[PDB]
Amino acid sequence: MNVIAILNHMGVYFKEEPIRELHRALERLNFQIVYPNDRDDLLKLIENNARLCGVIFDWDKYNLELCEEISKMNENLPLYAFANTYSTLDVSLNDLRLQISFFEYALGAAEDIANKIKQTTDEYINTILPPLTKALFKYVREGKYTFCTPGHMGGTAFQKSPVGSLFYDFFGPNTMKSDISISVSELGSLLDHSGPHKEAEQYIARVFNADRSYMVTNGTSTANKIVGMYSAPAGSTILIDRNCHKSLTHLMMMSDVTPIYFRPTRNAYGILGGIPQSEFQHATIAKRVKETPNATWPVHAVITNSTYDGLLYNTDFIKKTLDVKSIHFDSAWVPYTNFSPIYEGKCGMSGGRVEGKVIYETQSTHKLLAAFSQASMIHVKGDVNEETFNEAYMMHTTTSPHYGIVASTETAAAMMKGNAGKRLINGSIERAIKFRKEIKRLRTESDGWFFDVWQPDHIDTTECWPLRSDSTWHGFKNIDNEHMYLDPIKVTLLTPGMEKDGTMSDFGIPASIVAKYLDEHGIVVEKTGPYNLLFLFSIGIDKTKALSLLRALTDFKRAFDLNLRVKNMLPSLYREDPEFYENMRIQELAQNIHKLIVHHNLPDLMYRAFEVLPTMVMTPYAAFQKELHGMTEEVYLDEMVGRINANMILPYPPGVPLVMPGEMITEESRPVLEFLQMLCEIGAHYPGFETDIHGAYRQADGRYTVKVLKE
Amino acid sequence: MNVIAILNHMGVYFKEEPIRELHRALERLNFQIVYPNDRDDLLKLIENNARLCGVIFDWDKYNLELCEEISKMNENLPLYAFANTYSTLDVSLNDLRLQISFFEYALGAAEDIANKIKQTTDEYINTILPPLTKALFKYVREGKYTFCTPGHMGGTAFQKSPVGSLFYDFFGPNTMKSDISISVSELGSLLDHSGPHKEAEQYIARVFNADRSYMVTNGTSTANKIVGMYSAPAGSTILIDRNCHKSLTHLMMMSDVTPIYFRPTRNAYGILGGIPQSEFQHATIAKRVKETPNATWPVHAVITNSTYDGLLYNTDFIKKTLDVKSIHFDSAWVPYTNFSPIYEGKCGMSGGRVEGKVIYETQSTHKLLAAFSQASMIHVKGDVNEETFNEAYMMHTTTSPHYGIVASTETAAAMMKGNAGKRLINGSIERAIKFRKEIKRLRTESDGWFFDVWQPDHIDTTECWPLRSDSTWHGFKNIDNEHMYLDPIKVTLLTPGMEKDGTMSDFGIPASIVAKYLDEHGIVVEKTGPYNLLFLFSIGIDKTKALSLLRALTDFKRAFDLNLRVKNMLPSLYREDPEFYENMRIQELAQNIHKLIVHHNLPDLMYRAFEVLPTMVMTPYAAFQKELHGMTEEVYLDEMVGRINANMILPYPPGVPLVMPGEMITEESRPVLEFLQMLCEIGAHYPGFETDIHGAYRQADGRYTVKVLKE
């Protein structure tokens, strides 16, 4: 905030020489001065920037509707109207409700005007800032010597070493002084929820429409642990989504709990869809309790809302009909929910306080909002035992947190209050929708093949487009109406190779080549399956990045039709093994990997492997207990049927836990083994496209091993 | 189509004198010529008008993106690019896909260019017109003498009488020649579905996404009769909404059928809400079948979708779970459904062909679309007996229809194909939403009281806003989530008098005074209840009418705060009885009618009267049979308990059938009698606010009579 914009030169002297004196005084007060030519120049200057902290304009040539337009753009922005001809009498109430401060044109009075402008800018900065970030900035500005942890003590240890000086010159001084610990008593403490921290969690609670809100400093991988260790005591039972994270599996291995796994649907692409409506009612839950050993009525439920590919649920249905005392939504990919009414009825915090149960939501703030990594939140909705749940939160977090992460966690919510946050969210959603409309437009504009995007055939409104059973763009057969809602900002491109009914085509490009090409040209894809990409259109995405992406896709199309060699187009993949990719064209490589997928029948195996659940011999807690006692042997992959698995098997494709720790692959679940063997067989042909299975360990001969339990 | 717009004067002569010669030739060919100054002038000229049928522009100073923008505005509009400097080579495919015809700058060649322009305009007119309207216009243009019915024979009977000449000079010649009969063999016949008529019903079937579409010429009051006489044979049973029309009651009195009445919800305002989700499942339907005499499983269902106040249903739920073989949606108030994806999943024709049942929808085209009155449609979805249903359609319609109504019925759908219809529907919805946003804005801007509008507290997106159980703006208690969707274009204003929880305030204005004031100032309200208005924001509404309405509301507020006399402000109500309204102020009148509502407790009685169903002694067909035999006596209102009603009682407020023909008011339904007596008691005090009950007949002494059956 040092940019203060003065409107145009009227022409007469008595209201220009005071303006030039104020210019000189403001430059003396370390303010950059910009000179927009007219009104629309000011509108564009304010929307394209954010460092602007003041507008000076004459109240004669520009009326007070150029206070209201800026108010629609930013409510808290100070503007400085200069009163010459309009008297006191010419002011309405709506002018008085805006951030304007009136001044006069007097020669030699520029010093007091500049001091008042500096004070107003300071008030604006101290108004828009959240309280803990405000206090941290104040503490760094009054920077005191310290004799406490951390050891760098304001980064003055990095000023006395060469590699330390490189680190210090990279990061800069303010992010070294911002790292302090709980010994600084004026900032309170995260662990005890005191002072500026307590004001911060109350601020987070207002913003996100939650009763009590927490600010985790390790991540939602730890927030899931906190929620599932509070609400699910040992010996109890949980309803965990099979579409889960590794963190929930880790939680189940720490705690002595027992699962019933929900059964999500999926298409031939490998996109993890959702649980049908039948598996949230009392009948199916009671049945699955009945045929699970050592199982009682579930006391907690964990649901991934949304999925990895951005499929929201009808959460009002869930909160009405799921008859458990605590429903947890692992909303790691949807933290931005409250800030656009598009997502109404699509999170745990949507709607009011539900009766008889506590709704948890564990937004991963760093993922889609603007926050530093390892930042997360736990929003609750209901009544919880305050000391027990506070102690459970204290149990998993560290004792001396990184205050940069905490300040970023709060500043992410502070970016969403007012009109600026609504403008951010609506701009991101509208940009995502416009990108979707041209990618379907360029599909019908181009010749031959082009990238498809997995979205409804007619989208033109800003809403979460519901997945209807009467349409076939999604691919989930016999899907329930109003249970799924596509998130517009998680754009999933598609590549040729798949037909609409689910069978495979002949000409195709698997998405690994497209992702590697985009990585070569300096744009990064989130994660790819066999024939899909994913692009997070968060609040950071502007039209520069969107156009560069669209124009990396087009250059890939041109380079693939021209059929350039692997050496020229993909040097990063060429360097994987130059002997192999020396005389190979890209069309031959794409055709070869596509034929390896087709002949081995990848999508049918990937479907039929996840439509059958492995037999739960013992709870994953018992599997971890037997793993700790050294009762694990590494049998080869083929002889794994009838054996209890000790470590989780997580195959890419698709990215969802296939075999849990403690489950047996029986003869009824042989397509699981066929899929694993097929994936190992196809991954050992072409370098750079190596097999990515978390749990299976590569040997030298080419056959993988899985840690199973001894007999 | 006679307006052809030429872009600006370049300056050089060789491309101006041919343009002036083409100007002269086009004026010789009876084309009005407009001269927009530059590009944005042309954009505004095209959006503000529709009679423009051609743009002539130079291909040098204006590129071909000013073909694409006009294409987004109107796809079929002919434009005439003049090629001078850009050669053949400078044309892309997207230019070739547009309606441009290229010409050259040659002196003396303006005659052939003007003839080609006239031919292109004729092609454009014959392209955008629907086939039957095209053939009717062609027949009138080639206007032949006739010796057949109708008797005016092209309106030449009105040219020979003074009052006939007044009628002819009012209507004009083209709407007299357009009225012909089936004797003109080249237009086919509506009754037999032949020729241009058959092409018209197939055109209607494409447009509205229906299998077979019919075009009724009496109205949906007859279309309901057609559907319920085909699908519901005599001796069978129907599931008719209690929120029905008079036409459905008339249908039930013609046919020997038996009802189970659905039970809609309602708020304290008197707005007819909707049926809960529980009354569409098999259990409640089987129960209500079991305790109804002479009743079997229902073979047809009739549902008013939407209601009178624009509350759409989740029709996918209905078409999945309502286990009847034919579901009829009386969509008289929502005919515009297909033309914006906002209404997806909110009509009978939404989604695909449902299995095992036929979905009827009977859009009243004249109501919200642009069509002449008594126009209606019957869209089916499924398989019906073609000859039996065609004979049922022939049974109720006339034999010689008004071809103006038929042409208007088809032209209403023809207004919705292309980009112009989508622009109409989206403009109407956006205008409705913007009106809603300022009426809530002016509520918080004004002093004291202001008009409220019955809508969610936060609306900023173009969607049907769902009625959520976690909010209280609607007033329907314990409402089911995603069953109701507010239609944005049926704006229901509210007046002071009601609190948010349902109880009455002290200061209030009943909506009759506001409606009468608006009628005095030349704007018409659709229909009013006790404290609500209704404004149809159809495709006809532009911002002129919206601003005039908002500014009749504001002038009423100013005149009510100033407390003008009834004589000056409401002369039309003053003339009702000048002796009574001589020395009365408007605040006293509003306070008096509000106190009459409060002391008699109108909303509680209006609620408790419709929460209790009158006892069905006999089917309404039997009631009509006993009414025809002269077995009806007129007992007074107070002694009507224990008596079988012969004629329907339809009280205003609210506008929904309260007592059906053939039903008895028992001691369990005494609040019905209390509500009727209260309404008669309050309507006999203030003139001009007389009691509007259809069925109860006013006597001279002041006590009403209802035709009941003899004992």
Closest CA to B211 of B221, B201, B224: B201
Residues 6+ apart with CB under 8 A from B516: B570, B572, B573, B688
Residues of A in contact with B445 (CB under 8 A): 94
The three state secondary structure string of A392-442 is HHHHHCCCCCCHHHHHHHHHHHHCCCHHHHHHHHHHHHHHHHHHHHHHHHH
Measure the CA–CA gap between A120 and B626, rounded to whole angstroms.
Answer: 84
CB A342 within 8 Å of CB A462: yes
Which residues on chain B place their C-beta less than 8 Å from a C-beta of chain A? 94, 314, 316-317, 320, 340-342, 344-345, 351-352, 445, 458-463, 466, 468-470, 481-482
**Length of chain B measured in residues:** 711
Question: How many Cβ atoms sit within 10 Å of the Cβ of residue A475?
Answer: 19
CB A386 within 8 Å of CB A230: no
In chain A, which residue's Cα lies nearest the Cα of B316?
Answer: A481
Q: Å from A67 to nearest chain B CA?
A: 17
Whether residues B481 and A341 touch (CB distance < 8 A) is answered with: no
Fill in the DSSP letter of residue A224. Answer: H
Instruction: Specify the 3-state DSSP secondary structure of B485.
Output: strand
Fill in the DSSP letter of residue A637. Answer: S
End-to-end CA distance of chain A: 68
A&B contacts, CB < 8 Å = 54
CB A291 within 8 Å of CB A285: no
Bridge partners (DSSP) of residue B532 are B494
Q: What is the dihedral of CA B108, B114, B115, B120, to 10 degrees?
A: 140
Q: Å from B44 to nearest chain A CA?
A: 20
CA atoms within 13 A on the CB side of A462: 15
Whether residues B468 and A316 touch (CB distance < 8 A) is answered with: yes
CB B350 within 8 Å of CB B344: yes
In chain B, which residue's Cα lies nearest the Cα of A468?
Answer: B351
In chain A, which residue's Cα lies nearest the Cα of B353?
Answer: A470
- Name the method of structure determination: cryo-EM
Phi and psi at residue B256, to the nearest 5°: -85, 75
CB A615 within 8 Å of CB A661: no
Measure the CA–CA gap between B122 and A688, rounded to whole angstroms.
Answer: 64
Reported in sequence order, the residue ranges of B45-178 that DSSP labels E, i.e. its strands, are 52-58, 79-82
Closest CA to A611 of A508, A477, A706: A477
Whether residues B344 and A460 touch (CB distance < 8 A) is answered with: no
Instruction: Specify the 3-state DSSP secondary structure of A247.
Output: helix
Residues of B in contact with A320 (CB under 8 A): 481
Packing angle of the helix pair B403-414, B131-141 (nearest 10 deg): 130
Question: How many Cβ atoms sit within 10 Å of the Cβ of residue B633?
Answer: 14
E strand or H helix at B628: helix B620-628
Phi and psi at residue B545, to the nearest 5°: -65, -40
Measure the CA–CA gap between A642 and A663, rounded to whole angstroms.
Answer: 10
Question: How many Cβ atoms sit within 10 Å of the Cβ of residue B296?
Answer: 11
Residues of A in contact with B469 (CB under 8 A): 316, 351
Measure the CA–CA gap between A642 and B318, rounded to whole angstroms.
Answer: 48
Instruction: Tell me how far CA of residue A169 lies from CA of A143, A161, A162, A172, B425, in angstroms.
Output: 19, 12, 10, 5, 59
CB B226 within 8 Å of CB B216: yes
Residues of B in contact with A461 (CB under 8 A): 340-342, 462-463
Whether residues A468 and B344 touch (CB distance < 8 A) is answered with: yes
CA atoms within 13 A on the CB side of A219: 12
Fill in the DSSP letter of residue A479. Answer: P
Reported in sequence order, the residue ranges of B423-531 that DSSP labels E, i.e. its strands, are 452-453, 465-466, 484-486, 490-491, 493-494
Measure the CA–CA gap between B652 and B626, rounded to whole angstroms.
Answer: 27
Phi and psi at residue B20, to the nearest 5°: -70, -35
Resolution, angstroms, 1 dp: 3.3
In chain A, which residue's Cα lies nearest the Cα of B447?
Answer: A93
Residues of B in contact with A314 (CB under 8 A): 482
Measure the CA–CA gap between B54 and B56, rounded to whole angstroms.
Answer: 7
Measure the CA–CA gap between A93 and A64, rounded to whole angstroms.
Answer: 11
Measure the CA–CA gap between A342 and A310, rounded to whole angstroms.
Answer: 14
Residues 6+ apart with CB under 8 A from B288: B260
Joined together, the tokens standing for residue B116 give: 């080609």
Helix residue ranges, H only, A39-143: 39-48, 65-73, 93-96, 110-128, 131-141
Question: How many Cβ atoms sit within 10 Å of the Cβ of residue B115?
Answer: 12
Residues of B in contact with A445 (CB under 8 A): 94
Instruction: Tell me how far CA of residue A659 lies from CA of A92, A241, A330, B335, in angstroms.
Output: 68, 14, 21, 53
Question: How many Cβ atoms sit within 10 Å of the Cβ of residue A148?
Answer: 11
Joined together, the tokens standing for residue B130 give: 């629907």
Q: What is the CA radius of gyration of chain B?
A: 29
Joined together, the tokens standing for residue A686 give: 């072409």
Closest CA to B328 of B357, B292, B352, B353: B357
Reported in sequence order, the residue ranges of A49-103 that DSSP labels E, i.e. its strands, are 52-58, 79-82
Joined together, the tokens standing for residue A47 give: 């929307």
Residues 6+ apart with CB under 8 A from A646: A623, A626, A627, A632, A661, A662, A707, A708, A709
| Pick from A469, A470, A482: CB nearest B482 | A482
Q: Å from A341 to nearest chain B CA?
A: 7
Q: Å from A328 to nearest chain B CA?
A: 20
E strand or H helix at A636: strand A632-636
Mutate to test the interface with B, among A482, A484, A485, A486 (most CBs of B within 10 A): A482
CA angle A329, A332, A338 (to 5 degrees): 75
Residues of B in contact with A482 (CB under 8 A): 314, 316, 345, 482
Measure the CA–CA gap between A244 and A221, rounded to whole angstroms.
Answer: 11
Measure the CA–CA gap between B702 and A236, rounded to whole angstroms.
Answer: 73
Instruction: Tell me how far CA of residue B670 lies from CA of A226, B596, B605, B710, in angstroms.
Output: 59, 21, 10, 21
Q: Å from A352 to nearest chain B CA?
A: 6
Measure the CA–CA gap between A486 and A466, rounded to whole angstroms.
Answer: 6
Whether residues A351 and B468 touch (CB distance < 8 A) is answered with: yes
Please enumerate, as own/partner, the contacts of B567-576 that have beta carbons within 8 Å and a separation of 24 or more.
B569/B517, B569/B520, B570/B513, B570/B516, B570/B517, B570/B520, B571/B520, B572/B516, B572/B519, B572/B520, B573/B516, B573/B520, B573/B688, B576/B687, B576/B688
Q: Å from B470 to nearest chain A CA?
A: 6
Closest CA to B418 of B33, B74, B25, B12: B74
Q: What is the CA radius of gyration of chain A?
A: 29
The structure tokens 């459905």 sit at: B248
Joined together, the tokens standing for residue A420 give: 């600026």
| Pick from B459, B460, B461: CB nearest A463 | B461
**Which amino acid appears at position A617 of this protein?**
V
Question: How many Cβ atoms sit within 10 Å of the Cβ of residue B425?
Answer: 22
Bridge partners (DSSP) of residue B82 are B58, B103
Closest CA to A425 of A466, A364, A370: A370
Instruction: Specify the 3-state DSSP secondary structure of B147.
Output: coil
Whether residues A320 and B481 touch (CB distance < 8 A) is answered with: yes
Q: Å from A241 to nearest chain B CA?
A: 24
Whether residues A468 and B316 touch (CB distance < 8 A) is answered with: yes
CB A534 within 8 Å of CB A526: yes
In chain B, which residue's Cα lies nearest the Cα of A93?
Answer: B445
CB A62 within 8 Å of CB A7: yes
Which residues on chain A place their C-beta less than 8 Å from a C-beta of chain B? 94, 314, 316-317, 320, 341-342, 344-345, 351-352, 445, 458-463, 466, 468-470, 481-482
Closest CA to A331 of A352, A359, A303, A309: A303
Hey, CA dihedral for A185, A187, A191, A192, is it positive or negative?
Answer: positive
In chain A, which residue's Cα lies nearest the Cα of B445?
Answer: A94
Where does residue A343 rank: exposed (0-12), middle (13-18), buried (19+ CB within 10 A)?
buried
